[PDB]
Design a binder for this molecule. Structure first.
Ligand SMILES: Nc1nc2c(ncn2[C@@H]2O[C@H](COP(=O)(O)OP(=O)(O)O)[C@@H](O)[C@H]2O)c(=O)[nH]1
Ligand SMILES: Nc1nc2c(ncn2[C@@H]2O[C@H](COP(=O)(O)OP(=O)(O)O)[C@@H](O)[C@H]2O)c(=O)[nH]1
Ligand SMILES: [Mg+2]
Ligand SMILES: [Mg+2]
Lengths: 248, 252
């Protein structure tokens, strides 16, 4: 049982911080290279892939990531044939990928859109709003609506895709309102209300998991519990298949 | 008595919301497409017409010479004043539309400044008075803010980016003492913009309301006083005597 998550997006959005907060939940310098850390603990081995980048010229800035993803597929295609005859086949393909969106309060940057368009064709992308704590209530509500609109209008198929029922009753909910998940990621534990909790120490404490504070708990449950398998299935049966099909 | 402040930086940093904040203090916002200067004739004690110029984006796929459009505007005003410096109309007081002060917004990424940000700043400083500001100061923590301010100061110093108060211009040893504590100690101003008049201005935080003008909450008050009272004149003088003069010299 192996699950791979990857964080993508602009620099300085708390992508790296989230990775660690994510790991501390189930259980910070600047990213320069694509390094993926995996924790062999819940049965499951969850490895999260970090990334940097956000420059004077950003032409084809996605290729590096696309090369990596495609690199993981080719590897699985070579390892899909059980030459070593192993009961289980190691899978390092990117199942779920989170694209961090700067909460600019305006329309999505052209670069964000194109970047998501390319990846959506090759990987399961789940839109996320970084540093949600920055935005006000009315602001965040409107920003999500703006995001959902801009995405749908730009023909960006993101998980859960409409194409691939009880699930249809919930996919609409997760497509329709909840997403993109607005997250606050804090690596620090502070005892709040009698128990150790994770949260930002804003002079104003904000609880990373508290459903009343932010949607991190929702996103976490969504990717690690509810849709953990669906992600893997769509990765293998659609994306990966499409790769080898074009390859062969 | 015309005072001209221009707000610059990448999109979605709170520049426009701050422009309105500044006016609203010393007296639903859409994305800006064109450069628009807002003039509001308001009262030091006497009358003063300050026009706050607004700047769109900076934020795109390929950002080359994205400063060119602004340089062109700034230079457009220098040519205009050069054209109106000779009082053919024999005017007692001459209308001034030159950018005296220019605030540059730096996203609080908590990392080293983006190379584009540096390039953007470097060109402007050699044509105008730049004053480094950190947008959405409220996002950061206390320890994070301190580290970022120091980080910005270092990067700018290292890159040779002369911002107001310029190191080159102060002559007096006393002048240096005061100016060394404003650009080392004080800059860059960590500000929080708020338009909605709530009856003290501020940002509506869930935990509690945050006073935009409070010194204990943010450094907006400091920035206002600096650019409106203390150094308003100094900014103008350097603009006229050095920046403008340099342009006029090059024009020949
Ligand atoms: N307001 C806010 N700031 C955050 C949050 N998470 C991280 N930050 C800050 O933003 C900076 C981003 O750093 P990092 O975690 O490496 O994000 P990265 O740019 O993807 O590498 C950090 O210095 C954090 O102090 C958040 O949820 N809200
Ligand atoms: N956290 C925080 N958010 C702000 C602040 N000022 C503005 N904002 C929000 O960020 C968005 C930026 O919009 P705007 O004022 O037009 O900035 P602009 O993109 O530079 O024009 C607005 O929708 C505001 O709700 C601030 O001081 N702190
Ligand atoms: Mg990073
Ligand atoms: Mg604007």
């Amino acid at each position: 049982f192996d699950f791979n998550i990857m964080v993508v997006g602009q620099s300085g959005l708390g992508k790296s911080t989230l990775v660690n907060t994510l790991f501390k939940s189930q259980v910070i310098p600047k990213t320069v290279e694509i390094k993926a850390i995996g924790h062999v603990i819940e049965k499951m081995k969850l490895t999260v892939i970090d990334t940097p980048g956000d420059q004077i010229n950003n032409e084809n800035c996605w290729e590096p990531i696309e090369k990596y993803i495609n690199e993981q597929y080719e590897k699985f295609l070579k390892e899909e044939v059980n030459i070593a005859r192993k009961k289980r086949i190691p899978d390092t393909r990117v199942h779920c990928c989170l694209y961090f969106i700067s909460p600019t309060g305006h329309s999505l940057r052209p670069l964000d859109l194109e970047f998501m368009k390319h990846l959506s064709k090759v990987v399961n992308i789940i839109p996320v709003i970084a540093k949600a704590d920055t935005m006000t209530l009315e602001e965040k509500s409107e920003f999500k609506q703006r995001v959902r609109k801009e995405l749908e209008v730009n023909g960006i198929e993101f998980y859960p895709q409409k194409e691939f029922l009880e699930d249809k009753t919930e996919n609409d909910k997760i497509r329709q309102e909840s997403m993109p998940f607005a997250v606050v990621g804090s690596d620090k534990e502070y005892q709040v209300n009698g128990k150790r909790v994770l949260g930002r120490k804003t002079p104003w404490i904000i609880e990373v998991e508290n459903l009343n504070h932010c949607e991190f708990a929702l996103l976490r449950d969504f990717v690690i519990r509810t849709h953990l398998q669906d992600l893997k299935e769509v990765t293998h049966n659609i994306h990966y298949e499409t790769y080898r099909a074009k390859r062969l």
